[PDB]
């Protein structure tokens, strides 16, 4: 409801960091609004852990903390001809996101960039790598190839977790698609949020 969405935006106000210089303020806002759909318990946990969601106006590797990834081919991106220099988002111990690259087809094939990235942070920092737990590995073994991109999502349980998470929280349509395609994963996320 309205109050809860606002609470989540308030939490995100203490998580999201905007870039210095010129950038698309309207699209940055849109990204925050999509992130506000994530269950508040995860957002509160991100805040408590001082996890920042860094929005960027340029390449990830032009940031001092990611310069070491220049020329490095990300996990699962083998054969793409792309390196981290070309990748618009990152999630894990940190989160970094290029403004304007949210949608599928903008340098990636995730249903939504910021939700996928933030899911990685929630997985790693908040949930202590639950995607690599025995419970999730069993679910992944059954349903991990039912959301497409099977050489990525079907291979890395942390990626299946992150994209399922994104389907669950992006909108009603994707939420429904996940339920139909991956019922055990859907139930798992549903219970995770209790």
């Amino acid at each position: 409801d309205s109050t809860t969405i606002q609470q989540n935006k308030d939490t995100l106000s203490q998580i999201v960091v905007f870039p210095t210089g010129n950038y698309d303020k309207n699209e940055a806002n849109a990204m925050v609004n999509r992130l506000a759909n994530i269950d508040g318990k995860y957002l509160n946990a991100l805040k408590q852990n001082n996890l920042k969601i860094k929005l960027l106006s340029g390449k990830l590797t032009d940031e001092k903390e990611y310069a070491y990834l220049k020329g490095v081919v990300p996990k699962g991106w083998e054969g793409t001809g792309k390196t981290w220099d070309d990748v618009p988002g990152l999630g894990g111990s940190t989160v970094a996101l290029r403004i304007g690259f949210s949608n599928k087809g903008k340098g990636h094939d995730a249903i939504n960039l910021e939700l996928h990235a933030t899911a990685h942070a929630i997985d790693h920092i908040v949930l202590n790598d639950i995607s690599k737990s025995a419970q999730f590995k069993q679910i992944f073994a059954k349903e991990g190839r039912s959301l497409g991109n099977v050489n990525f999502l079907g291979v890395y349980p942390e990626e299946f977790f992150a994209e399922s998470f994104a389907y669950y929280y992006l909108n009603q349509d994707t939420n429904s698609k996940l339920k139909s395609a991956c019922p055990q994963t859907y139930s798992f996320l549903q219970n995770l949020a209790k």
Binding site: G91, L113, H116, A117, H124
Partner: peptide, 7 residues
């Protein structure tokens, strides 16, 4: 730790 989006 670092993880990319879906290629």
């Amino acid at each position: 730790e670092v993880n990319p989006p879906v290629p």
